[PDB]
Amino acid sequence: MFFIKDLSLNITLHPSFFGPRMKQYLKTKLLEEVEGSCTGKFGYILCVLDYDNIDIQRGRILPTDGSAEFNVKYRAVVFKPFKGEVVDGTVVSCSQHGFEVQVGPMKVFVTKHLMPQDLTFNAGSNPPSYQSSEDVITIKSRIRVKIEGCISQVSSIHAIGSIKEDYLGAI
Amino acid sequence: VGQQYSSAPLRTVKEVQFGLFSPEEVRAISVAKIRFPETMDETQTRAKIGGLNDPRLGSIDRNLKCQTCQEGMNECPGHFGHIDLAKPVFHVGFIAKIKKVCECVCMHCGKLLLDEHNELMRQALAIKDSKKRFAAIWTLCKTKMVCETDVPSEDDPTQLVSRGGCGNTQPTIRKDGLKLVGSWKDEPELRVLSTEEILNIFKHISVKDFTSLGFNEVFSRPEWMILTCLPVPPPPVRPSISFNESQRGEDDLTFKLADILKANISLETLEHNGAPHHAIEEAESLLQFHVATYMDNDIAGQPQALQKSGRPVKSIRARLKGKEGRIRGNLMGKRVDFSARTVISGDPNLELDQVGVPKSIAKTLTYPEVVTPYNIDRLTQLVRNGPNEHPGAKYVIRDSGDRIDLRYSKRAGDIQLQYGWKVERHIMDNDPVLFNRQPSLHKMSMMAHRVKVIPYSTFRLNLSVTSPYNADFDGDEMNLHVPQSEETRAELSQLCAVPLQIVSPQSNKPCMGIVQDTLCGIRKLTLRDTFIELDQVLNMLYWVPDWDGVI
Amino acid sequence: LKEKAIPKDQRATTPYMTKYERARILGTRALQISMNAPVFVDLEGETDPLRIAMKELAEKKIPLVIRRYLPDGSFEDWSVEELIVDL
Amino acid sequence: IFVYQNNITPSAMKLVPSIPPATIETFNEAALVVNITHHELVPKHIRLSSDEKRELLKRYRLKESQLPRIQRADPVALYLGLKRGEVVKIIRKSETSGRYASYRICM
Amino acid sequence: LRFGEMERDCMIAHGAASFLKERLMEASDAFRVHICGICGLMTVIAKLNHNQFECKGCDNKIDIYQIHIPYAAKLLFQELMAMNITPRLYTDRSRDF
Amino acid sequence: AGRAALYKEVYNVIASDGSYVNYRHMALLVDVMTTQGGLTSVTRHGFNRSNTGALMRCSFEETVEILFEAGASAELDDCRGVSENVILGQMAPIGTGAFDVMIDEESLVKYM
Amino acid sequence: RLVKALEDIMVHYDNTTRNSLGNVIQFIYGEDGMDAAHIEKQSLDTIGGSDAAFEKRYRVDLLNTDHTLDPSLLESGSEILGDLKLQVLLDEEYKQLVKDRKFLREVFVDGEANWPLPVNIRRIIQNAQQTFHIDHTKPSDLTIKDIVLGVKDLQENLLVLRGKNEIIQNAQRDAVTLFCCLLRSRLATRRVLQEYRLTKQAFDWVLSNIEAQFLRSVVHPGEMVGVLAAQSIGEPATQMTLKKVTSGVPRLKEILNVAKNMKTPSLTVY
Amino acid sequence: VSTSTFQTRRRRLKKVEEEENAATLQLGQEFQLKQINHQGEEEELIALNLSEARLVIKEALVERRRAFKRSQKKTREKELESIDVLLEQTTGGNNKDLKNTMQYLTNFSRFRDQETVGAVIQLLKSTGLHPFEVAQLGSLACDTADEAKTLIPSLNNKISDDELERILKELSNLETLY
Ligand SMILES: [Mg+2]
Ligand SMILES: [Zn+2]
Ligand SMILES: [Zn+2]
Ligand SMILES: [Zn+2]
């Protein structure tokens, strides 16, 4: 699931930093702008890779403001989830219309009616739980989830999913 | 300009793609749904109606509104509205090409009047190039005038094979004013060419046919030459010069769009209602007029639709029009800041490139010098000195896109400076300027000079740069411009310098000799007859700045 | 395509500096030096970035590469180290 | 190479360019009474091989388009039986260099 | 004061490209707009505060670009749109050449 | 021989007056008049017709009409030219802007 | 109008002169690659005069009791009389002077010798003359191997285009041709010693100053040729305050417009 | 200020079309097998299973805690807090995401030896399935394909019941204990 891609970055720079550690500040600034980030394209950009061989290339100096643009060539580890995809994670919160699970930097969400046609909601407990013959899902339990849909959003990929299929649900 | 940061990644334009507005591309650009010919007044309550100008586009008056974006005027560009016409109508300046396209295609069936079954044609098809391809094809098949079903294949003139169905004769086409006319062939049969019709025809033409006939599948397909809905031009395209309150001030352009809209409603309320069918067309030729008038109002068809007062109305083609028009006048040069005109006179004492600049201007004009170690002392000095002591300054500018009136603000004699700020300061002596004397006939009318700040109200300069700009003293007026970017004064000072153009690459020679008084006397003096004496001679020697210090 | 790069050997064009190049480089530099840029010379007593970068050139200390473009679609890289100054 | 005295049938030429490969050039007496090329105001144009051509194109980086051009019914062009895609090396005097080395493709 | 055609040509002669750019932008017209990366139409809903962009229908909130260009030409483009011709300006080329 | 006579005459225009122009000048003018194929005139029917940036072309007489024919024929401007840039207030790729400038990662270190 | 035709025409970075599209106009500006400023009117002494004075002033023959140089001029001058090894050069050189005169007489039928030429050489040797204070009463020290073998070299160093390719090289030569001819004209061996009065140094200094002052005068790739030349036929024209044939102003217009139906169309039968 | 990748196709204006995603392996036009490298060289897909990831981050973050001092010049349970330390110095202080994921991984991995890991890799990358199918198979447990290709739909007909069966059998072996 987790991926690794080559990417780049238009980073501009003030004529102040035309000193001799310029390189590292470029590295840094990149890490600021990118690390932990998220788009709809790739996804949760987790961490950069191979900090040593970070691709610089000369920088072109912009026509009027002194600044200079660098196209940082780099490559990183990242994370984008998908429809129909299966991943398991630890529960994180519970309501009445369902419960939420955390996987990677991301959160999948499951609604009640996306659970066994016999699974029950116990709000008369603490912390709130879901009951069943043998099953007892709760605050922390680990569960296998079928991601049913992703929804790009600002700086977060969120999603929905299910545990109704076979071989699915708590583990 | 259009300040305040923007998350937007900056770029530059490399290519401009010229295409044609599809009715849906418009019907999607569009915020608002323009239906009302009244600008504003909510039944008279100063504001605007959800019909024209800002139903959800740009805004008049200094109030933030504008579909969310807010921001407000300076910063806001227009947001387009759309106007659904009644029935499709013609473009004005595309009408020549409409005719020349109708002449190459079979109407009613929709296809070429020539295939690869005809060498003079197939050989124009080799003509790679829109302008001359289309041209060879139109010259080629404007003669052919029946929808052939069968042609002599490249074998022999005996067996003709079959390509496309129908044959229904092609009516030879003539244009009249803002209508098209055909005449199918004893005696012809003259029938008018109706829009919707012609439209459908274009709109059933196949893609390859498109292509080979100078048209582009994605950026410009024939249909779009015949408008369904309308690009409704956002507010500051057509800016109202209001007079305080209870008045208005709208634009001719806005009035032509209100006029159009009107006409459209008028037509429409005949096609729902009791149609004197052939009196409906009597009003469609109004829509067809106005929509052609708001694009162009100087055609051949004399009727130059005025507007209540004689005023012809300024069709859009008139804003782009040559000289003074947007391009030959606004985008190929403009009025500009940091400039200065004045009466010029000549002084025989400032080094060639010096240029006597009156106090009132070394006072008026700003150089934005940044705030930096080597100058701080200087900069602050000016600042306190204030915009009236000759060597003063006029604005300080903070790292927060914020000015400071160095003649207003309380903190006048206050403000410490800031490493990374800007002093817009008065104009110092030895500074780079871009002097010049129109008419602009060569490099030599347009050079850079070092400033010498001086009294009285006259521009001052060196007798011998009189010939480069070519200015007499019967009262000639001159232009001056000021650098702004450091590298601006670079290009100026290493390229435009007045002593750079002492040798001219036009006649491979000097273009800045000695003159009048000077020369005239340099001779009167050169003479064998001319013997000077000690007293004077000395005054002479000293008079010369570099004089080694030796008799 | 990055194959649009004329390798530093097999190089082509005038080894001298064009008045144009120069004015633009002196510019760029003075402009960034009044931008609180780092200098690489001793200010023997200079304040104006023009004079400054002038005397940054005469000591060819200026971290600058003229990427020259050749019609069709090519480039040759020439550092101010490299070029000369007859001008 | 065919020479006509005063004219050829407007249907006799109708069967000239229909015998590949070889080609066919009409000509007029009065059009050959004197030498075009020997007039003071012309220079020498020169045929090139496909190799010479492609070499000019690679060593100047030029595309076909980007090259200056010469008509086809240029008197000079007929003189040397010019064809579509061919190239001359015009070569002339100069009050500035003595010799200037020009090029042209054929239209 | 006016600085036009003829002047523009002289300064072309001196070859001072930048001086031009400035004299005719930061010394006059000047102006910032946002453009889609799919249709060179100035369609962007500039949310320069809440940090959203968009030109729905072109369904883009993502590929968009800031650009400096004299307001006069901003107008000219809107105007040529009035006459139904899309002048789609682009950030990059494809023709190469 | 064309280009030639052409110069000669353009030249007797100038030398008739008694002036001095340096060959390279009108020489150029003329090479521009000829190259493309035959005799191209300095006039709207003349050179304007060619292929320049559509935009450049429409800073010469036939504005609106150009832009119309241009937007119909799906034109696409390179912008590799003055007028084009100019309208877009971008630095005109001329002399002082015929080339990019870079900082040099490497050599920047040598200078401390 | 004029200007609007050549705006975008400039000297691109290979000294080709082209337009925004790419299409070429001049292959090397002014058919030479040179720049109107650094150019002054020098006299071509190889093309005029009688064959008499040509032979006199330029002929150098060691194997002759009247044609060899009088050792007053050159130092190593009597230990030269009849040197078969050097006469090999003197004759080759003088063969190049021959070839030249008849090439220049090909290009300039007029007979005109006075011309727009880069690098003022008339003066460069006056600066030299009074810069080393040489005397017209004492002997040189250059070898005749030196002289013509030095010149032979200086030529090469006058580049103008650079590629490593025959096309390019040759074309270059083309270009430099004329100047070369002037070089061979005024660095000729009879001249160096008989007329000028050089010395090892003086000669080597002149060699160098020529070279550089050459590379200076080359056209700067960038310069806006089009607009240039244009403004420069507009400039002399605006000053034409107006032989019975259409002259100037009107004729000029005719011309630019592609003068079809023309006014006075004389026709000169030689 | 946006961030770029290695494959812009023509802005043909034609915006519409690009499909949705599923375990029909159908991914964005950003994640199909053939993707061009950084030096321009075509290269397959880099889809890494759980753990394989944790190792990648740990390591490339160790070379980072190394380089981050080369210029200074002038066990399940335990790995948790050890890395809650490594990050604690190497990040910028905002990667809540990146730390979170470190926990997730470090807890759910099936392998924690650059050895056993590789082993698995050279085992699976034998049936040239989509580097995705691979990954998922390399971070989710099972017994019969009945579970296997049910939770990993993309297979089904691709690799046989009994052979994916063997591969499962082998994987529950190489299953690095905790
Ligand atoms: Mg006067
Ligand atoms: Zn708005
Ligand atoms: Zn038909
Ligand atoms: Zn869009």
Short mmCIF file of N, CA and C and ligand atoms in Angstrom, two decimals, chain B residues 57-58 66-67 69-70 76-79, ligand 2:
data_model
loop_
_atom_site.label_atom_id
_atom_site.label_comp_id
_atom_site.label_asym_id
_atom_site.label_seq_id
_atom_site.Cartn_x
_atom_site.Cartn_y
_atom_site.Cartn_z
N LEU B 57 -21.24 38.87 -9.90
CA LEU B 57 -19.93 39.20 -10.49
C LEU B 57 -19.38 40.48 -9.90
N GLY B 58 -18.39 41.07 -10.58
CA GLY B 58 -17.70 42.25 -10.06
C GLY B 58 -18.64 43.27 -9.45
N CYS B 66 -19.17 40.53 -3.69
CA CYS B 66 -18.72 39.84 -4.89
C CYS B 66 -18.64 38.39 -4.46
N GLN B 67 -19.56 37.56 -4.96
CA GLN B 67 -19.61 36.13 -4.62
C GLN B 67 -18.40 35.60 -3.83
N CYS B 69 -15.41 35.84 -2.85
CA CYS B 69 -14.04 36.33 -3.05
C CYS B 69 -13.78 37.62 -2.30
N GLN B 70 -14.82 38.43 -2.15
CA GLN B 70 -14.69 39.73 -1.52
C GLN B 70 -13.45 40.42 -2.06
N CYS B 76 -9.94 42.65 -7.61
CA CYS B 76 -10.98 41.90 -8.29
C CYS B 76 -10.93 42.10 -9.80
N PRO B 77 -10.99 40.99 -10.54
CA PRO B 77 -11.22 40.99 -11.97
C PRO B 77 -12.67 40.66 -12.14
N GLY B 78 -13.18 40.75 -13.36
CA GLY B 78 -14.58 40.45 -13.56
C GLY B 78 -14.92 38.97 -13.49
N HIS B 79 -16.15 38.69 -13.09
CA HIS B 79 -16.65 37.33 -13.13
C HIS B 79 -17.81 37.31 -14.11
ZN ZN I 2 -14.32 38.93 -7.61
#
